Design a protein around this ligand. Structure first.
Ligand code: HEM
Ligand SMILES: Cc1ccc(N)nc1
Length: 292
């Protein structure tokens, strides 16, 4: 069976990775005009999720470990349309710190983005190791958005995610927006789309949603406030188990933050065996916590 053992970049410690975090965070601060002033935070979170979400628990293929998004098959996956923006953002960071692995860089970008957008601390472990082009997973492992709750549940079980983890992870859809040219969907999930909050759940419960076709002829749910939900988003209030958890997170942002942090770390670590003597997970300071 395929095993991927975490191997710390030789000679590196917490402080080295904090420097990489800081470079990402400083560039996030600088590049604030991207995507009509949203900034790069959301697309970096999506990149970290898409490089991880190719994992298959049945044979340990895909996942974040190998950094295989750098290869054309995966870079050009139609499911990844738009993520090239995140890759280009990270290019100068990788040039500044060439010692970091691709998987560590892509995953760290997501952690940095969540924290810099005032989200929870996400513990992060190093040691993903670049693997060759023939280890790149085929396209088609990332999820469709036109589906229902049953599809969502079945999909996420391939990643060993349970209902609470699924609902918590989807809270990231308060970030950024859908772009018609990338995915055939258009619009934001809420008003505060570059600050990490529980707005996704509040909006799911409190907005007046109308099912409509968009200009790409796909169905999405649109509110009078100018927000949208993907069919897979809206499925979280159609399924009774998911709905219960949506209510919990709409009522308690702190609980959402706690559960999101665990689920996101788990997502980014699926497929990786951490030696029992590996470093403990790192918790990076924000720029603000460092006075930078
Ligand atoms: C059923 C599972 C999911 C589906 C079907 C889905 C689908 C989508 C779609 C269609 C887009 C729009 C892409 C575009 O037009 O640019 C999007 C954006 C996004 N996705 Fe998801 N997603 C899923 C789960 C997740 C998860 C688990 C996370 C992270 C924890 C995530 C984070 C994001 C973020 C942050 C964006 C905004 C990107 C930007 O503004 O550039 N998604 N997703
Ligand atoms: C990126 C995004 C925006 C809104 C929503 N409901 N889902 C995902």
């Amino acid at each position: 069976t395929l095993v991927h053992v975490a191997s710390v970049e030789k000679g590196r410690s917490y402080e080295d990775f904090q420097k990489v975090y800081n470079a990402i965070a400083l560039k996030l601060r600088e590049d604030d005009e991207y995507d009509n002033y949203i900034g790069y935070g959301p697309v970096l979170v999506r990149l970290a999720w898409h490089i991880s979400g190719t994992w298959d628990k049945h044979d340990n293929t895909g996942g974040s470990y190998g950094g295989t998004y750098r290869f054309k098959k995966e870079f050009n996956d139609p499911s990844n349309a738009g993520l090239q923006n995140g890759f280009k953002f990270l290019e100068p960071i990788h040039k500044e710190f060439p010692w970091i692995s691709s998987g560590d860089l892509f995953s760290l970008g997501g952690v940095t983005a969540v924290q810099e957008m005032q989200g929870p601390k996400i513990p992060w472990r190093c040691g993903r190791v670049d693997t060759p082009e023939d280890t790149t997973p085929d396209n088609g492992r990332l999820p469709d958005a036109d589906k229902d709750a049953g599809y969502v549940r079945t999909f996420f079980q391939r990643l060993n995610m349970n209902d609470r983890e699924v609902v918590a992870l989807m809270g990231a859809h308060a970030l950024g927006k859908t772009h018609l040219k990338n995915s055939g969907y258009e619009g934001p999930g809420g008003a505060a789309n570059n600050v990490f909050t529980n707005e996704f759940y509040l909006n799911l419960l409190n907005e007046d949603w109308k099912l409509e076709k968009n200009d790409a002829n796909n169905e999405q749910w649109d509110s009078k406030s100018g927000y949208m939900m993907l069919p897979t988003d809206y499925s979280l209030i159609q399924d009774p188990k998911y709905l219960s958890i949506v209510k919990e997170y709409a009522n308690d942002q702190d609980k959402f933050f706690k559960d999101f942090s665990k689920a996101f770390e788990k997502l980014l670590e699926n497929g990786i065996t951490f030696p029992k003597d590996a470093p403990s997970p790192f918790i990076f300071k924000t720029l603000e916590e460092q006075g930078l």
